[PDB]
Write an enzyme that holds these catalytic residues in place. Structure first.
Site, mmCIF file in Angstrom:
data_model
loop_
_atom_site.group_PDB
_atom_site.id
_atom_site.type_symbol
_atom_site.label_atom_id
_atom_site.label_comp_id
_atom_site.label_asym_id
_atom_site.label_seq_id
_atom_site.Cartn_x
_atom_site.Cartn_y
_atom_site.Cartn_z
ATOM 1 N N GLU A 144 52.541 19.575 27.868
ATOM 2 C CA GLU A 144 51.910 20.788 27.352
ATOM 3 C C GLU A 144 50.642 21.194 28.106
ATOM 4 O O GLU A 144 49.901 20.346 28.604
ATOM 5 C CB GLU A 144 51.588 20.592 25.864
ATOM 6 N N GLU A 169 59.801 24.619 19.150
ATOM 7 C CA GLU A 169 60.431 23.375 18.739
ATOM 8 C C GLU A 169 59.640 22.762 17.586
ATOM 9 O O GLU A 169 58.448 23.027 17.436
ATOM 10 C CB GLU A 169 60.488 22.409 19.933
ATOM 11 N N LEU A 194 57.442 17.436 14.433
ATOM 12 C CA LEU A 194 57.827 16.106 13.962
ATOM 13 C C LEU A 194 59.266 16.047 13.467
ATOM 14 O O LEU A 194 59.835 17.060 13.066
ATOM 15 C CB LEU A 194 56.893 15.661 12.831
HETATM 16 O O1 LIG Z 1 60.905 15.001 25.306
HETATM 17 C C1 LIG Z 1 59.967 16.069 25.342
HETATM 18 C C2 LIG Z 1 58.562 15.582 25.050
HETATM 19 O O2 LIG Z 1 58.578 14.985 23.728
HETATM 20 C C3 LIG Z 1 57.326 14.440 23.285
HETATM 21 O O3 LIG Z 1 56.322 15.417 23.161
HETATM 22 C C4 LIG Z 1 56.505 16.436 22.157
HETATM 23 C C5 LIG Z 1 55.757 16.044 20.877
HETATM 24 O O4 LIG Z 1 56.306 14.849 20.338
HETATM 25 C C6 LIG Z 1 55.861 17.169 19.845
HETATM 26 O O5 LIG Z 1 55.086 16.842 18.702
HETATM 27 C C7 LIG Z 1 55.367 18.491 20.449
HETATM 28 O O6 LIG Z 1 54.023 18.393 20.763
HETATM 29 O O7 LIG Z 1 56.090 18.794 21.655
HETATM 30 C C8 LIG Z 1 55.944 17.770 22.668
HETATM 31 C C9 LIG Z 1 56.633 18.276 23.925
HETATM 32 O O8 LIG Z 1 57.948 18.736 23.644
HETATM 33 C C10 LIG Z 1 56.850 13.370 24.268
HETATM 34 O O9 LIG Z 1 55.592 12.866 23.848
HETATM 35 C C11 LIG Z 1 56.731 13.978 25.675
HETATM 36 O O10 LIG Z 1 56.331 12.976 26.598
HETATM 37 C C12 LIG Z 1 58.082 14.572 26.095
HETATM 38 O O11 LIG Z 1 57.964 15.219 27.358
HETATM 39 O O1 LIG Z 2 51.342 10.682 14.717
HETATM 40 C C1 LIG Z 2 50.499 11.456 13.878
HETATM 41 C C2 LIG Z 2 51.248 11.945 12.654
HETATM 42 O O2 LIG Z 2 51.109 10.930 11.634
HETATM 43 C C3 LIG Z 2 51.879 11.225 10.459
HETATM 44 O O3 LIG Z 2 51.710 10.182 9.563
HETATM 45 C C4 LIG Z 2 51.393 12.534 9.829
HETATM 46 O O4 LIG Z 2 52.191 12.848 8.698
HETATM 47 C C5 LIG Z 2 51.482 13.668 10.852
HETATM 48 O O5 LIG Z 2 50.922 14.851 10.302
HETATM 49 C C6 LIG Z 2 50.726 13.285 12.126
HETATM 50 O O6 LIG Z 2 50.895 14.309 13.124
#
Ligand SMILES: OC[C@H]1O[C@H](O[C@H]2[C@H](O)[C@@H](O)[C@@H](O)O[C@@H]2CO)[C@H](O)[C@@H](O)[C@@H]1O
Ligand SMILES: OC[C@H]1O[C@@H](O)[C@H](O)[C@@H](O)[C@@H]1O
Ligand SMILES: OC[C@H]1O[C@H](O)[C@H](O)[C@@H](O)[C@@H]1O
Length: 490
Positions: A181, A375, A378
């Site tokens: 990101e 997307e 969680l």
């Molecule tokens: O596999 C794509 C991406 O997944 C994870 O990052 C996600 C993150 O978990 C979501 O909460 C949200 O922020 O979108 C992110 C990017 O899609 C992995 O941590 C990352 O390394 C990986 O590229």
């Molecule tokens: O990894 C951090 C995550 O912890 C979880 O226990 C919380 O419910 C999420 O809001 C938070 O983003």
């Protein structure tokens, strides 16, 4: 025709489908899963193309074999693919169940020059991504960080030319920072950060520090220093001198800093997108970037967490629309990584407004006339989460007389796992897919729903920073329905 309300659904593949040793581990197992996805009507899948795996041996020592095998299998299963150019490390963020560092040869350089990493006020170096400070420093065996990223994408384009020409790949998501990101690593779990900590500014490496000192000097205030009263990762805003009411963030010094800090990201994204456009010129694919959804503290005046992450967003200053405007010149898609959350699901002491943040971000994108995707943040398997995603995909519902006035370009679901395929969970997921498709069967020809992809054109002329920042003018969001008209139910 109803098909015009169709929003495609993609599913992220498991982390590490090809391991750190560049081996496509379990093709048979993946196949069984992919086939179930195809049967459920899923349009395509998404995968990280890890820099640390492919260019491991040394500079320009690429090995695309294992990924060629994976793409071959995906194609055989009748699915399209979204490819992420992952120039980051997997391991220190939420959900990272596997460790995949960036190239070892780059890490070796980091041993003699620690300033190639994002650094906090205390001096801790984060090794998950190269600081924007070295984007144009020719310190990596003759190459700059951006040149490394550019050469990588060109090699991908050339070695995967047959898959691109056959139309397997729909879009290229260009990684621009931690977790792919466009943001600073302000909330690192690896350093003890815990929700809803405000996070910390990550501009203390020697490259960024020098740039700042030179900038304030040209502004007539050579005595200005980086923030020293912003607190620590787990602090609350009111307990800091920088974010408290009438604090430093509202002073001439603070405003200058925050503008400088957020501007570095805009330019970082713009310059790398330029390279991505040249690398994929002529290919039938679209470009996209990822923006993190930092909803905590969104409901207080200081928007502390957003600011430390690099999004200078305040109630009277839009810090996201400038990004959308920057994307327009590249004809790129703004992928927002947090669409499933509801405010009521967040603890009250976090002052979270995920719903309002989504409305602000998507509205800004549509106002700037770019395409927006997203997307879930969680893992969720319940109806309420799917119904929220569907609401955001078509904020004003479906149109029976043609295309909806507002709709997202696509949604990527995180993530493929045995839990998702469990009978009851998969059962609900199938309904989610049907509803995203507006009650229509899976449609193989994207042209039918106005999603035809034409050859990538060269980017439009560079837009000056002052014009970009005009997008900071606050605007009212588009109207949102209280709930979707295409519910999954329960
Ligand atoms: O596999 C794509 C991406 O997944 C994870 O990052 C996600 C993150 O978990 C979501 O909460 C949200 O922020 O979108 C992110 C990017 O899609 C992995 O941590 C990352 O390394 C990986 O590229
Ligand atoms: O990894 C951090 C995550 O912890 C979880 O226990 C919380 O419910 C999420 O809001 C938070 O983003
Ligand atoms: O950066 C990791 C994750 O952090 C949190 C954000 O809400 C989410 O959008 C992001 O993907």
């Amino acid at each position: 025709n109803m098909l015009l309300n169709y929003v495609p659904v993609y599913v992220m593949l498991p982390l590490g489908v090809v391991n750190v040793d560049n081996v496509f581990e379990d093709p048979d197992g993946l196949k069984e899963q992919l086939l179930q996805l195809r049967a459920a009507g899923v349009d395509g899948v998404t995968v990280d193309v890890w820099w640390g795996i492919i260019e491991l041996k040394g500079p320009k020592q690429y090995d695309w074999r294992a990924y060629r095998s994976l793409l071959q299998l995906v194609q055989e299963c009748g699915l399209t693919l979204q490819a992420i150019m992952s120039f980051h490390q997997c391991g220190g963020n939420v959900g990272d169940i596997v460790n995949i560092p960036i190239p070892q040869w780059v890490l070796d350089i980091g041993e003699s020059n620690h300033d190639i990493f994002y650094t906090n006020r205390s001096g801790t170096r984060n090794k998950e991504y190269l600081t924007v400070g070295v984007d144009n420093e020719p310190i990596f065996h003759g190459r700059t960080a951006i040149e490394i990223y550019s050469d990588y994408m060109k090699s991908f384009r050339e070695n995967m030319s047959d898959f691109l020409e056959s139309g397997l790949i729909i879009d290229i998501e260009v990684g621009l920072g931690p977790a792919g990101e466009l943001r600073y690593p302000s909330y690192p779990q690896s350093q003890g950060w815990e929700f809803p900590g405000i996070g910390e500014f990550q501009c203390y490496d020697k490259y960024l520090k020098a740039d700042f000192k030179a900038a304030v000097a040209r502004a007539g205030h050579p005595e200005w220093e980086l923030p020293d009263d912003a607190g620590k990762y787990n602090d609350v805003p009111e307990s800091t001198g920088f974010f408290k009411s009438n604090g430093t963030y509202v002073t001439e010094k603070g405003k200058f800093f925050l503008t400088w800090y957020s501007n570095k990201l805009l330019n970082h994204g713009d310059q790398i997108l330029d390279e991505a456009n040249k690398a994929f010129l002529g290919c039938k694919v679209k470009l996209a970037i990822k923006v993190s959804g930092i909803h905590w503290w969104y409901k207080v005046e200081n928007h502390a967490a957003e600011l430390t992450a690099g999004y200078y967003n305040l109630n009277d200053r839009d810090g996201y629309r400038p990004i959308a405007r920057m994307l327009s010149r590249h004809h790129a898609i703004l992928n927002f990584t947090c669409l499933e959350m509801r405010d009521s699901e967040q603890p009250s002491d976090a002052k979270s407004g995920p719903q309002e943040l989504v409305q602000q971000v998507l509205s800004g994108g549509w106002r700037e006339d770019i395409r927006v995707a997203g997307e879930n943040a969680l893992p969720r398997y319940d109806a309420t989460a799917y119904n929220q995603i569907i609401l955001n995909a078509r904020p004003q519902g479906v149109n029976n007389n043609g295309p909806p006035k507002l709709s997202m370009f696509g949604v990527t679901y995180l993530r493929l796992s045995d839990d998702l395929l469990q009978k009851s969970n998969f059962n609900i997921f199938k309904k989610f897919v049907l509803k995203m498709h507006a009650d229509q069967d899976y449609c193989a020809n994207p042209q039918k729903y106005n999603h035809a992809i034409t050859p990538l054109k060269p980017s439009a002329p560079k837009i000056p920073i002052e014009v970009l920042l005009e997008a900071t003018k606050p605007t009212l969001p588009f109207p949102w329905l209280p709930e979707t008209d295409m519910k999954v139910d329960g």
